[PDB]
């Protein structure tokens, strides 16, 4: 099975960058990252675009890695509270703090809705 090999390989790539990552929860292929400017009231498209990995670290904290295929700089963020993630229109809006907002666009809308649910269920106690 192709997925067994893919997941094993991907986990080693993730662990090379972030040794504290314990497992991959789910994946989405073509994700683009946007950042919200607070004072300007405007969105900015970042240089980060690639494969999205929803992950768990050694302390079961939930987060995500975007492996940037364009440039070597990747992104690893935690999802600290389920209420910090909102499915707004075609985007996942992740607000870790009032002034610190990121937006994720996934090519496949089915990935966006599945990932939203998996985020919530991964944080469910």
């Amino acid at each position: 099975d192709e997925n067994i090999l893919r997941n094993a390989v991907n986990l080693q790539v993730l662990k090379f960058h972030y040794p504290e990552i314990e497992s991959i929860i789910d994946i989405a292929s073509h994700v683009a990252v946007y950042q919200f400017d607070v004072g300007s009231q405007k969105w900015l498209k970042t240089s980060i675009e690639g494969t999205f990995f929803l992950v768990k670290d050694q302390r079961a904290r939930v987060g995500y890695v975007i492996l940037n295929r364009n440039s070597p700089e990747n992104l690893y963020l935690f999802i600290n509270h389920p209420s910090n993630v909102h499915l707004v229109d075609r985007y996942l809006i992740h607000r870790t703090e009032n002034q610190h907002v990121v937006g994720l666009w996934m090519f496949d809308p089915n990935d966006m809705s599945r990932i939203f649910n998996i985020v919530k269920e991964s944080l469910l106690r």
Binding site: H30, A32, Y34, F36, Q41, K42, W43, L44, K45, E49, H86, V88, D89, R90, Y91, I93, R95, V101, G103, W105, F107
Partner: peptide, 14 residues
């Protein structure tokens, strides 16, 4: 491919 940043919502909460 990915939409222009201007297409993203600035809802009440944002």
């Amino acid at each position: 491919h990915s939409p222009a940043a201007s297409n993203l919502p600035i809802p009440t909460f944002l």
